[PDB]
Amino acid sequence: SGFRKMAFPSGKVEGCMVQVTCGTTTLNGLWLDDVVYCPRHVICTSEDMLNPNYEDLLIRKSNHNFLVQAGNVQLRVIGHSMQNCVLKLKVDTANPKTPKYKFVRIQPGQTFSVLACYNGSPSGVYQCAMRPNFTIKGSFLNGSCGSVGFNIDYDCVSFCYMHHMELPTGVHAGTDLEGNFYGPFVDRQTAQAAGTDTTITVNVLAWLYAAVINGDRWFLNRFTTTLNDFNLVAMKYNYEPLTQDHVDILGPLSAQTGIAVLDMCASLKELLQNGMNGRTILGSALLEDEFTPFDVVRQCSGVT
Amino acid sequence: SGFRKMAFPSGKVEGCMVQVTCGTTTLNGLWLDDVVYCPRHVICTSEDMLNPNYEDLLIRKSNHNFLVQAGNVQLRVIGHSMQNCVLKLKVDTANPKTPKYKFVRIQPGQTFSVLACYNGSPSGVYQCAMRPNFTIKGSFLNGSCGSVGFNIDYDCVSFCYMHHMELPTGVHAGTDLEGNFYGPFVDRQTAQAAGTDTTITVNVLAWLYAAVINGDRWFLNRFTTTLNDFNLVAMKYNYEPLTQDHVDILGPLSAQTGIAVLDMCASLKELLQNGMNGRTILGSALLEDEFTPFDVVRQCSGVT
Numbered sequence: 007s008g009f010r011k012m013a014f015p016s017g018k019v020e021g022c023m024v025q026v027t028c029g030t031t032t033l034n035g036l037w038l039d040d041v042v043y044c045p046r047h048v049i050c051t052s053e054d055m056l057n058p059n060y061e062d063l064l065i066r067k068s069n070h071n072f073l074v075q076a077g078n079v080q081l082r083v084i085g086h087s088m089q090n091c092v093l094k095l096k097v098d099t100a101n102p103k104t105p106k107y108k109f110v111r112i113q114p115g116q117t118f119s120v121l122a123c124y125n126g127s128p129s130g131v132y133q134c135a136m137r138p139n140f141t142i143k144g145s146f147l148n149g150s151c152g153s154v155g156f157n158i159d160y161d162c163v164s165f166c167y168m169h170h171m172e173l174p175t176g177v178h179a180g181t182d183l184e185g186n187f188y189g190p191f192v193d194r195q196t197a198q199a200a201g202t203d204t205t206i207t208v209n210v211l212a213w214l215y216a217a218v219i220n221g222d223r224w225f226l227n228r229f230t231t232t233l234n235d236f237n238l239v240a241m242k243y244n245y246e247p248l249t250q251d252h253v254d255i256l257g258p259l260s261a262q263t264g265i266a267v268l269d270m271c272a273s274l275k276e277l278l279q280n281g282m283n284g285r286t287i288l289g290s291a292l293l294e295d296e297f298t299p300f301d302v303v304r305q306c307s308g309v310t
Numbered sequence: 311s312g313f314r315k316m317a318f319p320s321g322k323v324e325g326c327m328v329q330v331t332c333g334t335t336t337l338n339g340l341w342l343d344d345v346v347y348c349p350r351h352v353i354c355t356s357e358d359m360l361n362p363n364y365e366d367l368l369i370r371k372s373n374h375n376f377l378v379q380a381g382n383v384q385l386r387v388i389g390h391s392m393q394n395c396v397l398k399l400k401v402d403t404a405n406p407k408t409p410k411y412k413f414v415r416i417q418p419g420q421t422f423s424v425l426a427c428y429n430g431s432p433s434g435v436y437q438c439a440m441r442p443n444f445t446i447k448g449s450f451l452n453g454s455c456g457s458v459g460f461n462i463d464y465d466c467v468s469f470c471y472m473h474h475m476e477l478p479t480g481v482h483a484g485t486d487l488e489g490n491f492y493g494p495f496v497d498r499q500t501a502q503a504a505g506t507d508t509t510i511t512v513n514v515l516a517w518l519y520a521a522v523i524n525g526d527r528w529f530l531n532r533f534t535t536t537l538n539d540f541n542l543v544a545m546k547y548n549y550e551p552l553t554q555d556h557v558d559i560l561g562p563l564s565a566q567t568g569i570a571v572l573d574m575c576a577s578l579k580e581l582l583q584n585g586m587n588g589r590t591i592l593g594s595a596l597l598e599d600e601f602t603p604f605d606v607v608r609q610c611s612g613v614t
């Protein structure tokens with residue numbers, strides 16, 4: 007029993023972190039096989055970041071200009087190429103610590119662990135969700151770029167995020183491992199509008215099931231609702247509309263607890279309309295949306 | 311910017327996790343140098359746990375009865391001994407992955423990361439605090455015993471906790487790495503009273519400084535208070551009494567922000583007396599006490 011915002015064990019990712027320096031800029035790189043992946047803005051000076059012409063800036067750089075260091079080891083760069091907003095630095099040595107891995111583009115509402123790094127060194131690990139508006143509310147300071155987001159399935163690390171920037175609002179933006187930004191963001195020091203965000207309804211429902219499993223039951227009521235009625239409430243409270251797909255993914259939790267999905271929706275409806283009345287759910291005084299139904303099942307069963 | 315409940319990178323601890331089996335019971339062990347540390351209740355059957363006589367139960371066990379497995383490797387046990395509530399299994403091989411480490415007994419109110427494990431395999435990592443009543447509100451299922459709590463200072467892992475049990479209330483109890491329980495708890499399946507808990511005042515104040523550093527300032531007011539006046543409020547709201555030692559540890563945050571400790575105490579006083587009025591602080595709708603002043607400084611500076 008107990009329920010925590012659990013991150014994946016970061017060990018397999020730590021073994022891949024390196025430091026990449028180009029000119030006066032230093033950030034983090036990800037060393038997998040004989041390739042180091044890093045944000046392409048490593049080639050920019052703070053002056054260039056206002057309106058960078060990356061193709062032009064990269065033309066002035068040669069393999070020997072990219073300094074890649076794994077702790078005390080210096081890696082020899084034998085190739086460089088830009089793919090979208092990432093630089094791929096071919097090195098002459100395959101990382102002996104390369105785990106089994108995939109590059110995945112996650113969907114909004116999905117969760118992942120971030121290994122925050124500075125100068126190629128891991129500082130900490132935290133679990134977070136990709137917001138419906140494609141931002142992440144992370145914890146990143148200058149030098150954290152190149153830190154990655156990932157999920158793990160037994161021995162396989164699925165890399166889904168690489169940190170590139172902090173918006174003027176203090177929210178974070180980044181790319182998949184092919185350098186495609188999540189959201190409308192560009193790697194330029196310019197004001198950028200993040201879309202209207204919403205709360206991840208299916209995640210809140212999953213978290214309400216986790217609360218029941220662990221003993222927090224006060225929010226359960228004598229009511230039920232329909233997808234249509236619930237969605238009218240979800241609309242008013244800036245929650246994502248619930249679909250049959252979301253109901254289907256909640257199936258295992260509905261089955262384990264014996265609380266029908268629409269009955270849980272009616273509890274969520276009353277919580278949205280009345281608030282928590284000074285009470286807590288799993289130690290939170292608000293409705294948590296950073297646990298997916300898969301996260302709840304995994305944590306509640308002890309999956310390693 | 312941004313502030314998260316960050317755990318230490320668990321890599322150095324993952325390299326130490328092993329599985330320990332004795333008879334029909336399996337749990338986690340910690341392999342450091344040529345010693346495997348695990349909870350002594352690995353020698354008990356669920357029947358023995360009601361009133362175990364550990365000295366007698368251990369006398370029936372021999373080195374060959376303790377099955378220690380590190381992933382696919384079987385370790386040869388050449389000695390066993392009980393120290394308080396831990397068993398120390400001497401093995402014939404030093405763990406090649408042993409990091410620099412210390413065994414420390416933490417104080418209540420201090421924080422640490424837990425690497426939750428099942429069958430010697432890491433499932434996840436989370437940050438938590440040792441409650442003033444010596445319990446931890448963790449996330450532990452059957453088979454999680456032997457999972458450890460730790461802090462890291464550059465390359466040194468300070469092991470401070472080993473998980474032994476879940477109280478009937480769903481809160482968790484465990485020992486330091488010499489097998490001494492934190493709190494009045496015993497390793498027996500019996501109802502056990504955890505003391506009256508309190509909120510860790512210095513941690514809440516540290517978190518209020520982190521909120522200011524990151525832009526959440528609405529709670530700052532035009533008032534100040536004294537240690538005596540604040541402690542009368544702390545008493546009423548089951549908060550730990552604030553001492554000059556706590557004020558001294560808050561010094562760096564008071565210096566960085568320019569908000570005097572007693573001025574922050576007056577903001578905390580108004581928050582305790584009036585609530586949050588439906589607002590949030592660093593994404594929380596309650597007063598967070600799981601970040602120490604050292605945690606706030608570390609996260610806010612990017613310490614690796």
Ligand SMILES: Cc1ccncc1NC(=O)[C@@H]1C[C@H]1CF
Pocket residue numbers: 047055146147148149150151170171172173192193194195311
């Ligand atoms: C200064 C900072 C802080 C935290 N995380 C990231 C950053 N850096 C940026 O925003 C880089 C300049 C842009 C490129 F899109």
Ligand SMILES: Cc1ccncc1NC(=O)[C@@H]1C[C@H]1CF
Pocket residue numbers: 007351359450451452453454455474475476477496497498499
């Ligand atoms: C069943 C469980 C669940 C989570 N964490 C731990 C446990 N196990 C226990 O409480 C063991 C029997 C006691 C020894 F003090």
